[PDB]
Design a protein around this ligand. Structure first.
Ligand SMILES: O=[N+]([O-])c1cc(Cl)ccc1NCCO
Lengths: 237, 300
């Protein structure tokens, strides 16, 4: 069934699994028309599909041309997402295919279940976690590749950079979610925290800066303060 | 008009005959039911006074043989049997009629209720859902499970309804996943109607039989099947106009006949609200929607 605080360590066992987040698949800007009506202009999106144990990110760029001439785009987006996830499983060798796919939004369960009927042994599950994967487009290098795309494209990343060389996947995921939660709650402050010190750089083959263990503790502590902060500024406490 | 003679009534029992029912006291001098309209299937059903557990009964068609009921004290139920000796049977019935030991099937002449609930129901098709080929009548009870229920255990004692499953490869064509899941016309028209049922009459017949087993026996699997078959039509954007018009009539009479007090367990709120208010066919069941709103507006 669903995934919550009680079975959290299941994410980091040795059964292959993927999280699917569809929150950035269909992205629009809303604007006024010359007649003073309102219209939307779609922009490129992405499917965020993440192996939480390995950090492997399968970033499917959704080009705005996939919406051309289509109706009910919020509903098509869920099915497009399911189609692309299913095509990804099919493209993987049997021993790399997931045993479970966890969707971050319950509206994805039926579209993915239907696209995966050929894979009856793959469990499709919801979660009760409030995961911050929508903030994936606050990662500059991911946002850049999505915005530059002129056609549909799959780009592969490791969202943990080299962290698993030094920490466990539990810890790596907890750092990732803290960074993403921060970027989601105040993007500017979050980004300031991460880049204030120009001596610490982001390697060309990475997404995040090259922090030492000690610098990560400091960073992690700043992101918590930021999250606690915005929570006060928000509720007045 | 035909007759179903009862050897006797050794245990106190509520007897059902189609949509009618009456009480028989233990060892009351009751020898059966007469004046049963020829031309329709019928169901004769039972609930013992001492154990309302297990409603059970027999679907039958008097044109297919001479049937009588005799209590079995070993198996503890009223059993339908066939009498092959036609002369022995006419002789047995005429004695009980002359002594007036039979209830009369009480058909009011304005009353098409039973016709309207069994219009498409045929004994030959019943016998394929209820497999027991040595008899011409079919036994059903509250606890019998359906073939699809056994998939999710005795197969001989199952209800072999047509399996309908909206998230199945049968229902969903590769490459039309969204299209076929949100508009089930393919599954209704090509897979089920053209493929399996051959025509709408056989479809409506199974639907009508499913309803009747749900209402008369509280057979949960039958209720699931009734709702599935309604939802499949209601969730199809493309349905022949005559099937929609007939579906509206069929359901109207089913809703009209349902006991007012059993609505809470026999009617699936989600299916009905979806069918009447959200589905492609939300504007196509005028009669059914009017009786549902006036009789069970709570459910909606
Ligand atoms: O023959 N019958 O028609 C029949 C009717 C009733 Cl009510 C009782 C017994 C029988 N038959 C006993 C079997 O030979």
């Amino acid at each position: 069934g669903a995934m919550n605080s009680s079975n959290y360590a299941e994410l980091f066992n040795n059964d292959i699994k993927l999280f699917v987040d569809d929150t950035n698949v269909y992205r629009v800007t809303v604007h006024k028309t010359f007649e003073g009506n309102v219209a939307t202009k779609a922009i490129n999106g992405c499917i965020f599909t993440l192996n939480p144990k390995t950090g492997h990110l399968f970033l499917k760029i959704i080009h705005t041309s996939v919406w051309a001439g289509q109706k009910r785009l919020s509903q098509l987006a869920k099915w497009k997402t399911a189609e692309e996830v299913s095509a990804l499983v099919r493209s993987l060798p049997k021993e790399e295919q997931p045993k479970q796919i966890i969707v971050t939004r319950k509206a994805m369960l039926d579209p993915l279940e239907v696209h995966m009927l050929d894979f009856p042994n793959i469990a499709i599950r919801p979660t009760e976690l409030r995961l911050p994967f929508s903030a994936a487009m606050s990662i500059d290098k991911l946002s850049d590749v999505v915005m530059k795309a002129t056609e549909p494209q799959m780009v592969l990343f490791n969202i943990y950079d080299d962290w698993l060389d030094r920490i466990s996947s539990y810890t790596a995921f907890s750092r990732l979610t803290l960074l993403l939660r921060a970027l989601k709650t105040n993007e500017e402050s979050a980004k300031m925290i991460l880049l204030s010190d120009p001596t610490i750089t982001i390697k060309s083959y990475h997404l995040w800066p090259s922090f030492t263990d000690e610098q990560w503790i400091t960073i992690e502590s700043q992101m918590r303060d930021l999250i606690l902060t915005e929570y006060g500024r928000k509720y007045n406490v | 008009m035909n007759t179903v003679p009862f050897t006797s009534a050794p245990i106190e029992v509520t007897i059902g005959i189609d949509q009618y029912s009456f009480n028989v006291k233990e060892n009351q001098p009751f020898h059966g039911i007469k004046d049963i309209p020829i031309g329709h299937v019928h169901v004769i059903h039972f609930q013992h006074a001492d154990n309302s557990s297990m409603r059970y009964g027999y679907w039958f068609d008097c044109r297919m043989g001479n049937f009588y009921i005799q209590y079995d004290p070993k198996d503890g139920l009223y059993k339908m049997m066939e009498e092959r000796d036609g002369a022995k049977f006419e002789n047995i019935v005429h004695n009980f009629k002359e002594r007036q030991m039979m209830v009369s099937y009480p058909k009011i002449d304005e009353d098409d209720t039973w016709y309207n609930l069994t219009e498409f129901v045929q004994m030959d098709k019943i016998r394929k859902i209820v497999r027991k080929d040595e008899n011409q009548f079919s036994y059903v009870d509250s606890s019998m499970t359906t073939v699809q229920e056994n998939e999710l255990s005795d197969p001989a004692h199952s209800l072999n309804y047509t399996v309908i499953n909206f998230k199945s490869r049968e229902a969903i064509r590769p490459g039309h996943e969204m299209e076929d899941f949100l508009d089930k016309s393919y599954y209704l028209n090509t897979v089920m109607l053209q493929g399996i049922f051959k025509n709408s009459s056989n479809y409506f017949g199974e639907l009508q039989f499913a309803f009747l087993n749900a209402m008369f026996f509280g057979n949960y699997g039958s209720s699931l099947q009734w709702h599935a078959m309604i939802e499949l039509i209601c969730s199809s954007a493309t349905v022949p106009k005559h099937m929609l018009d007939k579906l509206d009539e069929i359901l109207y009479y089913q809703i009209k006949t349902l006991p007012e007090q059993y609505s809470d367990i026999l009617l699936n709120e989600r299916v009905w609200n979806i069918c009447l208010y959200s589905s492609f066919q939300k504007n196509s069941l005028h009669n059914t929607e009017k009786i549902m709103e006036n009789k069970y507006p709570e459910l909606l």
